[PDB]
Motif scaffolding. Structure first.
Motif, PDB file in Angstrom:
ATOM      1  N   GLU A  22      73.561  67.903  44.628  1.00 28.42           N
ATOM      2  CA  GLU A  22      72.712  68.184  43.470  1.00 28.42           C
ATOM      3  C   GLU A  22      73.194  67.471  42.204  1.00 28.42           C
ATOM      4  OE1 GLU A  22      69.842  70.657  45.499  1.00 28.42           O
ATOM      5  OE2 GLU A  22      69.879  69.444  43.673  1.00 28.42           O
ATOM      6  N   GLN A  23      74.506  67.460  41.980  1.00 29.37           N
ATOM      7  CA  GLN A  23      75.046  66.775  40.811  1.00 29.37           C
ATOM      8  C   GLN A  23      74.758  65.277  40.867  1.00 29.37           C
ATOM      9  OE1 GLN A  23      79.201  67.518  39.863  1.00 29.37           O
ATOM     10  NE2 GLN A  23      78.881  66.880  37.736  1.00 29.37           N
ATOM     11  N   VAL A  24      74.912  64.681  42.050  1.00 23.30           N
ATOM     12  CA  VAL A  24      74.705  63.234  42.210  1.00 23.30           C
ATOM     13  C   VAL A  24      73.224  62.849  42.093  1.00 23.30           C
ATOM     14  CG1 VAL A  24      74.974  61.247  43.748  1.00 23.30           C
ATOM     15  CG2 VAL A  24      76.874  62.805  43.392  1.00 23.30           C
ATOM     16  N   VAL A  25      72.340  63.641  42.701  1.00 21.53           N
ATOM     17  CA  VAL A  25      70.894  63.425  42.541  1.00 21.53           C
ATOM     18  C   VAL A  25      70.482  63.439  41.064  1.00 21.53           C
ATOM     19  CG1 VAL A  25      68.588  64.440  42.921  1.00 21.53           C
ATOM     20  CG2 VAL A  25      70.140  64.102  44.853  1.00 21.53           C
ATOM     21  N   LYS A  26      70.956  64.439  40.325  1.00 22.26           N
ATOM     22  CA  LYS A  26      70.657  64.562  38.903  1.00 22.26           C
ATOM     23  C   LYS A  26      71.154  63.350  38.119  1.00 22.26           C
ATOM     24  CE  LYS A  26      71.263  67.707  35.026  1.00 22.26           C
ATOM     25  NZ  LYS A  26      71.896  68.976  34.579  1.00 22.26           N
ATOM     26  N   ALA A  27      72.366  62.895  38.437  1.00 20.95           N
ATOM     27  CA  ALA A  27      72.958  61.737  37.768  1.00 20.95           C
ATOM     28  C   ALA A  27      72.212  60.442  38.068  1.00 20.95           C
ATOM     29  CB  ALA A  27      74.434  61.606  38.117  1.00 20.95           C
ATOM     30  N   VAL A  28      71.758  60.284  39.313  1.00 29.29           N
ATOM     31  CA  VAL A  28      70.914  59.147  39.700  1.00 29.29           C
ATOM     32  C   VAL A  28      69.642  59.138  38.848  1.00 29.29           C
ATOM     33  CG1 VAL A  28      69.414  58.238  41.550  1.00 29.29           C
ATOM     34  CG2 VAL A  28      71.800  58.796  42.049  1.00 29.29           C
ATOM     35  N   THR A  34      75.390  54.166  39.799  1.00 31.62           N
ATOM     36  CA  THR A  34      74.981  52.845  40.295  1.00 31.62           C
ATOM     37  C   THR A  34      75.309  52.589  41.770  1.00 31.62           C
ATOM     38  OG1 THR A  34      76.858  51.978  38.983  1.00 31.62           O
ATOM     39  CG2 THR A  34      74.613  51.514  38.197  1.00 31.62           C
ATOM     40  N   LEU A  35      75.943  53.567  42.415  1.00 33.57           N
ATOM     41  CA  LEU A  35      76.189  53.524  43.858  1.00 33.57           C
ATOM     42  C   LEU A  35      76.398  54.939  44.351  1.00 33.57           C
ATOM     43  CD1 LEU A  35      77.025  52.058  46.649  1.00 33.57           C
ATOM     44  CD2 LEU A  35      79.330  52.056  45.727  1.00 33.57           C
ATOM     45  N   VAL A  36      75.807  55.250  45.498  1.00 38.75           N
ATOM     46  CA  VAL A  36      76.072  56.518  46.170  1.00 38.75           C
ATOM     47  C   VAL A  36      76.760  56.238  47.499  1.00 38.75           C
ATOM     48  CG1 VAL A  36      75.039  58.572  47.234  1.00 38.75           C
ATOM     49  CG2 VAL A  36      74.235  57.769  44.997  1.00 38.75           C
ATOM     50  N   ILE A  37      77.860  56.942  47.730  1.00 39.31           N
ATOM     51  CA  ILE A  37      78.571  56.894  49.001  1.00 39.31           C
ATOM     52  C   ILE A  37      78.376  58.223  49.711  1.00 39.31           C
ATOM     53  CG2 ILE A  37      80.840  56.768  50.113  1.00 39.31           C
ATOM     54  CD1 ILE A  37      81.616  54.838  47.705  1.00 39.31           C
ATOM     55  N   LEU A  38      77.854  58.157  50.931  1.00 37.70           N
ATOM     56  CA  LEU A  38      77.618  59.347  51.738  1.00 37.70           C
ATOM     57  C   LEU A  38      78.557  59.348  52.920  1.00 37.70           C
ATOM     58  CD1 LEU A  38      73.732  59.388  52.172  1.00 37.70           C
ATOM     59  CD2 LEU A  38      75.051  61.076  50.901  1.00 37.70           C
ATOM     60  N   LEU A  50      69.248  61.819  49.739  1.00 38.02           N
ATOM     61  CA  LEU A  50      69.899  60.762  48.967  1.00 38.02           C
ATOM     62  C   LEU A  50      69.243  59.408  49.206  1.00 38.02           C
ATOM     63  CD1 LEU A  50      72.139  61.236  46.904  1.00 38.02           C
ATOM     64  CD2 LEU A  50      72.083  63.034  48.653  1.00 38.02           C
ATOM     65  N   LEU A  51      68.966  59.090  50.470  1.00 38.50           N
ATOM     66  CA  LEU A  51      68.365  57.800  50.822  1.00 38.50           C
ATOM     67  C   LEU A  51      66.952  57.650  50.253  1.00 38.50           C
ATOM     68  CD1 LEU A  51      69.924  57.404  54.352  1.00 38.50           C
ATOM     69  CD2 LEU A  51      70.192  55.719  52.487  1.00 38.50           C
ATOM     70  N   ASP A  52      66.183  58.737  50.262  1.00 40.69           N
ATOM     71  CA  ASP A  52      64.863  58.770  49.618  1.00 40.69           C
ATOM     72  C   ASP A  52      64.967  58.568  48.110  1.00 40.69           C
ATOM     73  OD1 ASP A  52      63.053  58.995  51.716  1.00 40.69           O
ATOM     74  OD2 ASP A  52      63.067  61.191  51.716  1.00 40.69           O
ATOM     75  N   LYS A  53      65.795  59.389  47.457  1.00 41.78           N
ATOM     76  CA  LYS A  53      65.938  59.372  45.996  1.00 41.78           C
ATOM     77  C   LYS A  53      66.482  58.040  45.497  1.00 41.78           C
ATOM     78  CE  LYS A  53      64.672  63.680  44.920  1.00 41.78           C
ATOM     79  NZ  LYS A  53      63.677  64.081  43.890  1.00 41.78           N
ATOM     80  N   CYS A  54      67.567  57.571  46.106  1.00 43.27           N
ATOM     81  CA  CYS A  54      68.177  56.305  45.692  1.00 43.27           C
ATOM     82  C   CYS A  54      67.289  55.114  46.013  1.00 43.27           C
ATOM     83  CB  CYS A  54      69.554  56.125  46.317  1.00 43.27           C
ATOM     84  SG  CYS A  54      70.768  57.318  45.736  1.00 43.27           S
ATOM     85  N   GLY A  55      66.524  55.215  47.099  1.00 43.11           N
ATOM     86  CA  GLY A  55      65.511  54.206  47.428  1.00 43.11           C
ATOM     87  C   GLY A  55      64.511  54.013  46.300  1.00 43.11           C
ATOM     88  N   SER A  56      64.005  55.127  45.771  1.00 45.52           N
ATOM     89  CA  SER A  56      63.062  55.114  44.649  1.00 45.52           C
ATOM     90  C   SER A  56      63.649  54.477  43.393  1.00 45.52           C
ATOM     91  CB  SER A  56      62.589  56.531  44.338  1.00 45.52           C
ATOM     92  OG  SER A  56      61.914  57.088  45.451  1.00 45.52           O
ATOM     93  N   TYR A  57      64.915  54.773  43.111  1.00 47.22           N
ATOM     94  CA  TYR A  57      65.595  54.244  41.930  1.00 47.22           C
ATOM     95  C   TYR A  57      66.269  52.886  42.174  1.00 47.22           C
ATOM     96  CZ  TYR A  57      64.822  58.606  39.343  1.00 47.22           C
ATOM     97  OH  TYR A  57      64.244  59.660  38.672  1.00 47.22           O
ATOM     98  N   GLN A  58      66.206  52.403  43.417  1.00 46.48           N
ATOM     99  CA  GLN A  58      66.860  51.155  43.844  1.00 46.48           C
ATOM    100  C   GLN A  58      68.365  51.168  43.574  1.00 46.48           C
ATOM    101  OE1 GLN A  58      64.267  48.069  42.157  1.00 46.48           O
ATOM    102  NE2 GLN A  58      63.133  47.923  44.093  1.00 46.48           N
ATOM    103  N   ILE A  59      68.980  52.290  43.933  1.00 50.57           N
ATOM    104  CA  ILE A  59      70.424  52.455  43.870  1.00 50.57           C
ATOM    105  C   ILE A  59      70.964  52.324  45.295  1.00 50.57           C
ATOM    106  CG2 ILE A  59      72.312  54.065  43.308  1.00 50.57           C
ATOM    107  CD1 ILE A  59      70.768  52.892  40.862  1.00 50.57           C
TER     108      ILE A  59
END
Length: 99
Positions: A22-28, A34-38, A50-59
């Motif tokens: 939740e914290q990382v999604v909010k920060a994105v 600028t990078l998410v590590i799962l 995460l893959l959906d959300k970061c996909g949308s933001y191109q992170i």
């Protein structure tokens, strides 16, 4: 002892990391990450989110290691979702993982 694990430790030292789904999604969403590590161990729904959300933001999102290795690297026990707050660290970590 991988280069990216060591570098992740330095990012933690520099307070350039966030953890928690939740914290990382909010920060994105706030343009702070600028990078998410799962973790490879992360639940499939966490991975999807995460893959959906970061996909949308191109992170970029990397799926690597396990929660023990990730936690250890940052001086914690276990972590599944890490967001990187520094663009320089993000670039370098991604390059190391992609190498």
């Amino acid at each position: 002892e991988a280069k990216w694990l060591s570098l992740l430790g330095l990012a933690a030292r520099a307070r350039q990391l966030l953890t928690g789904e939740e914290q990382v999604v909010k920060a994105v969403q706030n343009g702070q990450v600028t990078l998410v590590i799962l973790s490879s161990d992360a639940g499939i729904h966490t991975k999807k989110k995460l893959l959906d959300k970061c996909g949308s933001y191109q992170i970029p999102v990397k799926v690597v290691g396990n929660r023990q290795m990730l936690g250890r690297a940052i001086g914690k026990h276990e972590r599944v979702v890490i967001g990187v707050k520094d663009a320089g660290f993000s670039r370098k970590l991604a390059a190391l993982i992609d190498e």
